Amino acid sequence: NIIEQKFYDSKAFFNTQQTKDISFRKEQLKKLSKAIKSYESDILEALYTDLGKNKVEAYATEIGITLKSIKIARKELKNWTKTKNVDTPLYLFPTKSYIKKEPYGTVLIIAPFNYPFQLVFEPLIGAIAAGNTAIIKPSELTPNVARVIKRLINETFDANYIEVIEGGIEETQTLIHLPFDYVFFTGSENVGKIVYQAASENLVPVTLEMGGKSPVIVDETANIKVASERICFGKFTNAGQTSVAPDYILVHESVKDDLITALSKTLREFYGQNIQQSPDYGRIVNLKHYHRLTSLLNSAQMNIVFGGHSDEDERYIEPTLLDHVTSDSAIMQEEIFGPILPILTYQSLDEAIAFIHQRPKPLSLYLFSEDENATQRVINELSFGGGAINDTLMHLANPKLPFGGVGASGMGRYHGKYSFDTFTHEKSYIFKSTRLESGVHLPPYKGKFKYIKAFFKN
Amino acid sequence: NIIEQKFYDSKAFFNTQQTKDISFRKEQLKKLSKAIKSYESDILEALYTDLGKNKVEAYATEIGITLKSIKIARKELKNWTKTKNVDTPLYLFPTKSYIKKEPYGTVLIIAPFNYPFQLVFEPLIGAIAAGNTAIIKPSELTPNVARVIKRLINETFDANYIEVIEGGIEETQTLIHLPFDYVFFTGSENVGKIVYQAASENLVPVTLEMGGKSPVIVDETANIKVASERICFGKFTNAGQTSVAPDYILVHESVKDDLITALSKTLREFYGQNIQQSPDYGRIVNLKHYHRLTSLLNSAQMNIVFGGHSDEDERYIEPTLLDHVTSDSAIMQEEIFGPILPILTYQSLDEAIAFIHQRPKPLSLYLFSEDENATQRVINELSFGGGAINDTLMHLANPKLPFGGVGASGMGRYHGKYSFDTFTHEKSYIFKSTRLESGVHLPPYKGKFKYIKAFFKN
């Protein structure tokens, strides 16, 4: 019962009020930053062994972005946390209005395998800065990363302030049935449904970052070569294991063959002729997901127009393009979460929009177009978590942009101040001086109806 | 199966994209305002018959506040809905960053009996302004109000844009199992748990406005007479049937008797010697809640120090004060939601804080004190939805203050722009010109680690 003991110890530490002190929170952020730097080599090694993640990609998407976020949160903390004076309308004078920013208490953070470090620590920064205690459940599919995370945390913080729980679905099961004050989850739709039903039993608020199939629309006005470069960048980073990676392409009939040519050329520019030898290209997390993806390769074997090679001993899957893909294809029935890119054609933008609107709202959407009005149509008519015009993936790199889904792709958002907001309850309160008395708004109300009605109607 | 047919008709109308047009939303708000004015007399009559609500109170808490909110939402709509240009950091240049405000789709609004008009239409204003279609389920405990609401809506809007569903818990059961794009609920903890478990099955985001026992702390420095006036104002408005009404009082030992004297005097000033004859005082919604409260009166019979009279034929319960109340008392085991005010004593603020912290986080908290540092302690150490220093209830009257609970008292918030925000998905997106090309951030990554690391660490 150590999980539940760890939970109630964390609650007990929150009850001491020590995490509400602003200077306490700043010091924990310093220690977190110092701790990540001390472990930088071990984190890079763990990301490399578990995901084949090269150090450039690992720094830009896991370590460096976290260090930058800690720095910003620590330096902006007084701005984010300070009670706001809120305007009070004249009719409420002499009332003064305020909003106190306060923590929820003890929160739960669940992180998946694909960015196993960043998806632990970007939520954690928000939880720390908002004044919470935290329990972290990292992915056991990346076990070296999870252990490095546990070592780092345990040697830096008390377990009753921040603790890491290693395990699989059953450890997650134990955690989500505990009355946490907030639950933050990134992962699959399947597990997200379980987390959110368990939390609902305890009236626990949640943020869910889930999945779907993110479409890329490439219309007939697009800059094909630049589109192919930015698509491949967002698609084959982390070997496609990204929730906002281009899942599939809807390309206008007239430029499909141009796009296939440009994508193939870009992949050779990126990774060379033997992509298995490229030090810039990652690997599949484990054998289960590797076989999931090679099964999809086998299903689309007649449609491969680039790549398709694999090596089980390295959990390697070559960047692969598919042509003549339909709605019936196995590759269009599941979130790919891998380096397979199916290409479907459309004749008019209305068909592309209809296709996307028939499916769950995706976490991201991308449109490549030089046509302003097509851009406007897509942003206005299709709902999705967030996206990009003439780019992919990089809308996550601005911390001033909230990152989150909608509908099946999730609820809630984070990054930057939104990470702080997510773990913050905003508490409105007023003050009215007792030296200033008036019976105007008190009973008896005889004769006051004409006055109160005129107020609400002038 | 008309409920489900009405749901899917509403979805179909949203799919026409007509509600996303800003000028469409403004026109619906105009029609809503015109419609409430046309029905003003019938709304006042229905509130009077069902809740004994006098026209002054009904205008300040239901009709007038709604008309004012419609006016503000309509005039600020372009500000609220317009896509925001968001700052982009230099390292992402030439990227341009934006946030699109877009609706969820088809939403559900559930309203309880106590403010049966305002708790329908303040959420509705937000849903309308955010560009949604809506289905409303009003309380059947106030059946005349519910019918007036249904008449008003049906004669003003198409049923596939806004529709009202009359019924009880089983109609609510049918609605909460449908895949709405958002669910907004105000009511009891019991029903809120059912709504939120049902929504969780469908990955539906929610806002829950629930309950608890809102404490008033009156310390030894308080202005006793002014405190008693502002307490009675917030407590005996709507005959105590308010989620942010003072549920119970924790008063310092040294000023308890002063407070009881002042409260009794204020009640006589408000309502006279025969409070049943006062036209400024409301009635209990129905016989079930009336008997719930007279049962509580019977339990606290030896502790009544003011009031205690009742009349079943009018569903009338006199403003009642209780003394020598303990944690064991029946009156301290449930949300009173009525005109019974128990008074408990404490010796030090630490005891009052401990008492409140042992119970679920309440929707509101009030502190009456002239001691700055006591004010700071309470706001910093106790978490609650929202509250007031030296006042009660009025923190809901500033639309610039978010209104909502935390923990057991709820999740989410509304009023003013927060009503719009609640029914809005904020969709981040970027644009990057394809005329501006660069291979600096693309593979191959040979030699780029020193550059990317220096960036994240400078």
Are A83 and A101 contacting, i.e. CB atoms less than 8 angstroms apart? yes
- Residue B427 parent element (H or E): strand B424-431
| Phi, psi for residue B342 in degrees, rounded to 5 | -80, 145
Closest to A114 in 3D by CA, of A47, A56, A173, A176 = A47
Tell me the C-alpha distance between B185 and B111, whole Å.
6
Cβ–Cβ below 8 Å for B56 and A379:
no
Q: Which residues of A touch B444 (CB under 8 A)?
A: 270-272, 278, 280
Residue of B95, B430, B456 lying closest to A67 (CB–CB):
B456
Q: Which residues of B touch A386 (CB under 8 A)?
A: 427-429
Tell me the C-alpha distance between A7 and A2, whole Å.
8
The half-sphere exposure of B254 on its side-chain side, counting CA atoms within 13 A, is: 7
Please give, rounded to a whole number of angstroms, the shortest distance from the CA of A80 to a CA of chain B.
Answer: 16
Question: Which residues partner with A150 through β-bridges?
Answer: none
Are A108 and A135 contacting, i.e. CB atoms less than 8 angstroms apart? yes
Tell me the C-alpha distance between A451 and B67, whole Å.
15
Structure tokens at B227: 């405190």
Tell me the C-alpha distance between A180 and A200, whole Å.
11
The half-sphere exposure of B208 on its side-chain side, counting CA atoms within 13 A, is: 31
Q: Which residues of A297-324 are buried (b: 16+ CB within 10 A; e: fewer)?
A: beebeebbbbbbebeeeebbbbbbbbbe
Are A330 and A299 contacting, i.e. CB atoms less than 8 angstroms apart? yes
Closest to B456 in 3D by CA, of A47, A129, A37, A74 = A37
DSSP-derived 3-state class of residue B62: helix
Cβ–Cβ below 8 Å for A398 and B88:
yes
Tell me which DSSP letter residue B57 carries.
H
Best mutation target, A398, A438, A440, A451, to test chain B (most B CBs within 10 A)? A398
Tell me the C-alpha distance between B264 and B269, whole Å.
9
Q: Work out the burial of residue A371: count CB atoms within 10 Å of its CB; fewer than 13 is exposed, 13-18 middle, 19 or more buried.
A: middle
Tell me the C-alpha distance between A422 and A438, whole Å.
40
| Phi, psi for residue B341 in degrees, rounded to 5 | -120, 95
Strand B206-209 to strand B410-411: parallel, antiparallel, or no bridges (unpaired)? antiparallel
Please give, rounded to a whole number of angstroms, the shortest distance from the CA of B242 to a CA of chain A.
Answer: 17
Print the SS3 string covering chain A.
CHHHHHHHHHHHHHCCCHHHCHHHHHHHHHHHHHHHHHCHHHHHHHHHHHHCCCHHHHHHHHHHHHHHHHHHHHHHHHHHHCCEEECCCHHHCCCEEEEEEEECCEEEEECCCCCCCHHHHHHHHHHHHHCCEEEEECCCCCHHHHHHHHHHHHCCCCCCCEEECCCCHHHHHHHHCCCCCEEEEECCHHHHHHHHHHHHHCCCCEEEECCCCCEEEECCCCCHHHHHHHHHHHHHHHHHCCCCCCCEEEEEHHHHHHHHHHHHHHHHHHHCCCHHHCCCCCCCCCHHHHHHHHHHHHHCHHHEEECCCEEHHHCEECCEEECCCCCCCHHHCCCCCCCEEEEEEECCHHHHHHHHHCCCCCCEEEEECCCHHHHHHHHHHCCCCEEEECCCCHHHCCCCCCECCCHHHEECCECCHHHHHHCEEEEEEEECCCCCCCCCCCCCCCCCHHHHHHHHHC
Strand B304-306 to strand B320-322: parallel, antiparallel, or no bridges (unpaired)? antiparallel
Structure tokens at B440: 């600096």
Are A340 and A320 contacting, i.e. CB atoms less than 8 angstroms apart? yes
Tell me the C-alpha distance between B324 and B326, whole Å.
7
Residues A118, A137, A244, B15, CA torsion sign = negative
Chains A, B: CB contacts within 8 A come to 294
Tell me the C-alpha to C-alpha distance, in Å, between residue A381 and each of A220, B83, B420.
19, 14, 19
Per DSSP, helices labelled H in B64-201 are: 64-81, 118-130, 143-154, 169-176, 189-201
Tell me the C-alpha distance between A53 and A280, whole Å.
8
Structure tokens at B252: 């310092």
Q: Which residues of B touch A435 (CB under 8 A)?
A: 223
Please give, rounded to a whole number of angstroms, the shortest distance from the CA of A34 to a CA of chain B.
Answer: 12
Closest to A421 in 3D by CA, of A155, A76, A50 = A76
Interface of A with B in 253-292 (CB under 8 A): 269-272, 278-281
Are A420 and B456 contacting, i.e. CB atoms less than 8 angstroms apart? no
End-to-end Cα spacing for chain A: 63
Tell me which DSSP letter residue B333 carries.
S
Strand B96-103 to strand B84-86: parallel, antiparallel, or no bridges (unpaired)? antiparallel
Residues B198, B200, B206, B209, CA torsion sign = positive
Tell me the C-alpha distance between B345 and A211, whole Å.
53
Tell me the C-alpha distance between A145 and A156, whole Å.
17
Q: Give me the helix-helix angle, B64-81 and B118-130, nearest 10°.
A: 20
Closest to A118 in 3D by CA, of A419, A417, A360 = A419
- Residue B367 parent element (H or E): strand B364-368
Closest to B139 in 3D by CA, of B152, B150, B129 = B150
Q: Which residues of A touch B208 (CB under 8 A)?
A: 203
How long a stretch of residues is chain A?
A: 458
Structure tokens at A368: 């490549």
- Whether A1-211+410-458 and A212-409 share one fold: the answer is no
Amino acid at B136: I
**Residue B51 CB coordination number (10 Å):** 28
List, in order, residues 6 or more apart from A308 with CB less than 8 Å away. A297, A301, A318, A320
Structure tokens at A100: 């106190």
Tell me the C-alpha distance between B240 and B234, whole Å.
8
Tell me which DSSP letter residue B238 carries.
G
Cis bond leading into B443, ω under 30°? no
A84 close contact with B: CB closer than 8 A: no
End-to-end Cα spacing for chain B: 63
Ramachandran bin of B330, using left for φ above 0, alpha for ψ from -120 to 50, beta for the remaining angles:
alpha
Are B285 and A450 contacting, i.e. CB atoms less than 8 angstroms apart? no
Cβ–Cβ below 8 Å for B432 and A100:
no
Resolution in A: 1.8
Structure tokens at A251: 């390309």
Are B14 and A361 contacting, i.e. CB atoms less than 8 angstroms apart? no
Tell me the C-alpha distance between B60 and B282, whole Å.
14
Amino acid at B88: T
Amino acid at A143: P
Ramachandran bin of B170, using left for φ above 0, alpha for ψ from -120 to 50, beta for the remaining angles:
alpha
Are A180 and A56 contacting, i.e. CB atoms less than 8 angstroms apart? no
Q: Which residue ranges make up each domain of chain B?
A: 1-211+410-458, 212-409
- Residue B375 parent element (H or E): helix B372-381
How long a stretch of residues is chain B?
A: 458
Are A406 and A383 contacting, i.e. CB atoms less than 8 angstroms apart? yes
Closest to B95 in 3D by CA, of A133, A201, A392 = A392
Interface of A with B in 108-147 (CB under 8 A): none
Cβ–Cβ below 8 Å for B395 and A201:
no
Tell me the C-alpha distance between B37 and B355, whole Å.
46
Best mutation target, B133, B401, B433, to test chain A (most A CBs within 10 A)? B401
| Phi, psi for residue B393 in degrees, rounded to 5 | 75, -35
Amino acid at B120: V
Are A385 and A406 contacting, i.e. CB atoms less than 8 angstroms apart? yes
Are B189 and B223 contacting, i.e. CB atoms less than 8 angstroms apart? no
Angle of CA points B183, B184, B186, to nearest 5°:
140
- Residue B2 parent element (H or E): helix B2-14
Tell me the C-alpha distance between A47 and A53, whole Å.
6
Structure tokens at B124: 């509705």
Considering the four listed CATH numbers 3.30.390.30, 3.80.10.10, 3.30.420.10, 3.40.605.10, the one that applies to the domain covering A1-211+410-458 is 3.40.605.10
| Phi, psi for residue A427 in degrees, rounded to 5 | -110, 105
Closest to A217 in 3D by CA, of A338, A396, A378 = A378
Cβ–Cβ below 8 Å for B65 and A456:
yes
Tell me the C-alpha distance between B186 and B211, whole Å.
9
Please give, rounded to a whole number of angstroms, the shortest distance from the CA of B111 to a CA of chain A.
Answer: 19
Tell me the C-alpha distance between A322 and A306, whole Å.
7
| Phi, psi for residue B350 in degrees, rounded to 5 | -60, -35
Interface of B with A in 308-327 (CB under 8 A): none
Tell me the C-alpha distance between A247 and A256, whole Å.
16
Residue of B100, B426, B443 lying closest to A271 (CB–CB):
B443
Amino acid at B134: A
Are B176 and B199 contacting, i.e. CB atoms less than 8 angstroms apart? yes
Tell me the C-alpha distance between B282 and B259, whole Å.
24
Are B363 and B212 contacting, i.e. CB atoms less than 8 angstroms apart? yes
Determination approach: X-ray
Closest to B358 in 3D by CA, of B368, B340, B344 = B344
Question: Which residues partner with A100 through β-bridges?
Answer: A427
What number does CATH give the domain B212-409? 3.40.309.10
Tell me the C-alpha to C-alpha distance, in Å, between residue B244 and each of A133, B188, B336, B404.
29, 13, 11, 10
List, in order, residues 6 or more apart from A120 with CB less than 8 Å away. A109, A111, A136, A138, A149
Tell me which DSSP letter residue B446 carries.
T
Cβ–Cβ below 8 Å for A278 and B444:
yes
Residue of A20, A210, A389 lying closest to B429 (CB–CB):
A389
Tell me the C-alpha distance between A226 and B434, whole Å.
6
Please give, rounded to a whole number of angstroms, the shortest distance from the CA of B136 to a CA of chain A.
Answer: 21
Strand B206-209 to strand B182-186: parallel, antiparallel, or no bridges (unpaired)? parallel
Closest to B210 in 3D by CA, of B186, B194, B190, B240 = B186
